[PDB]
């Protein structure tokens, strides 16, 4: 019918009231300073409901911030402009974040950050938080005797109860090669019913109240009245302020399975009715999606795991082994940072650089960018009198969403290392076994020359990533197994912060039916009284993340499932909100409530 009501030569931004809007307004101010384009940030109530209404009239903000789930219904209605970042810009964000903001293939928002719920706990009330939902009733009873509760969280919004509902099988819409079946809905299967029954049981047994909402839970946790809550990264600042000694960790399991929170990509979309689309583009691309821009928002209220690689590298500290194809060497490179705990406190950084080149001239898989997530545990064999290390490691590939035949069983491993650190020569032999099906390494190492002159934990990375578990969907990214049996050369430099460096070269290959890692290490420039040569590192491989809260967010997100963005998501949310609220409050049984939700969603 008519023209836009939105004013030219300025930007009006809507963002939710739980996000860092004062921080974003600081980015606005800098933009205004540089360009003369005034930026107003607003945080209206129920803004995800008000946008489609005002935007259809040709009105509303120039930019709207929300999790990516609602943007497909906006895009279906013609309310969002197709965005046009070029290849160079797109390469600056994780690929998977761009996929969250596609509607019929087209990019319709800029991803900003990847959000998942975690378990937030009070370390003074609960130094070891529960691994299982099932143990929380007894924990509540114990805490109640001391006038505290175990757990309070927002039961009024379905986003917060969904991790429990989905844990044993509930799902929103079924995904089947390419799209969501709008008629195959998982809110009323056995798994959803069991989660929602567990929640209702908590309320019947008086471990939770039906009326707990976002404000009540946050105030209870921040005043030290409940030992746990469930919330997202945006809430961490208010906790910081309260001075409660908190941790953020993996959500509890239910019937043995991880909780499955929905994964939201906070995203910024451009109103189709804005006459300021180029200015909005410049703001989001050249001001907000920069390290300085995300930091201003992040310092206000934490974003989580940001979409922008450069700033996620600064926040996250390169926790995982990050792998890239090195086409020139028909191989790969990798970098990552290990953090070794120092005995009476502190952390000793070890910056790792890596490259692998196949030995044989035969074909190998060159992967897309991805990472390996590694967990290691160190122990001692009480019968072993030589200086030694017992290692158990688990490794899995992630980071996107024939030699392999030599690894389908359990392979014996042998390791030989000749070292020279500041002229101090030493040798290590190891043996054990790898089970690539489970990503599992079990090994024992001995210093064959007497006392190891460096801490054992500093040699863990040097002492067979062919034993990583690459899931089905990622097998084409496994360079390591594809090199075998002839194998590969692996080279590293490892720089120890404020101290020396290791340079390593290894051949990793089958000799007969044994996987053998033969290594030469040279250490130069170390301090004799430093952490390494002075043996000041704790004996473990805890390798804590720079920010354990971000690590816990990504752990929970990988166990979760990306929100669909289909227009039917608004009927989904309404239907589950109603079913959960009803069931909690004793209106109808869990079965009837979830059945009504199913019927409403699929109509
Ligand atoms: O509870 C339903 C609601 O869940 C999600 O909203 C989250 C949002 O993603 C987070 O950024 C944060 O603000 O908490 C909200 C829950 O209160 C969906 O994104 C949203 O569309 C849906 O209605």
Residue numbers in the entry: -3 to 397, 415 to 476, 480 to 619
Describing publication, verbatim:
Periplasmic binding proteins (PBPs) from bacteria undergo dramatic conformational changes upon ligand binding. We inserted cpGFP into the canonical family member, E. coli maltose-binding protein (MBP), at four different locations and performed high-throughput screens to improve the linkers and other sensor elements, resulting in relatively bright sensors with ΔF/F > 6. Finally, we report the crystal structures of two of the sensors in the maltose-bound state.
Typical metrics for quantifying local structural perturbation, such as changes in solvent-accessible surface area or distance difference matrices, identify residues for which the change in local environment is defined by the three-dimensional relationship between residues, but not their sequential relationship. Thus, we analyzed the change in dihedral angle (defined by the Cα atoms spanning four residues) to identify maltose-dependent structural changes in sequentially adjacent residues [Fig. 1(b)]; this analysis shows that the Cα chain is “torqued” around residues 175 (ΔDihedral = +41°) and 311 (ΔDihedral = −22°) upon ligand binding. Approximately 400 “XX” variants of linkers 1 and 2 for the MBP311-cpGFP protein were screened. This yielded variant MBP311-cpGFP.L2-NP (-AsnPro- at linker 2), which has a ΔF/F of 1.0 and a Kd for maltose of 2 μM. We set up crystallization trials with MBP165-cpGFP.PPYF, MBP175-cpGFP.L1-HL, and MBP311-cpGFP.L2-NP in the presence and absence of excess maltose, from which both MBP175-cpGFP.L1-HL and MBP311-cpGFP.L2-NP crystallized in the presence of maltose. We solved the X-ray structures of these sensors to 1.9 and 2.0 Å resolution, respectively, by molecular replacement [Fig. 5(a,c)]. GFP-H148, meanwhile, seems to stabilize the conformation of linker 2 of MBP311-cpGFP.L2-NP by H-bonding the backbone carbonyl of the linker 2 Asn.
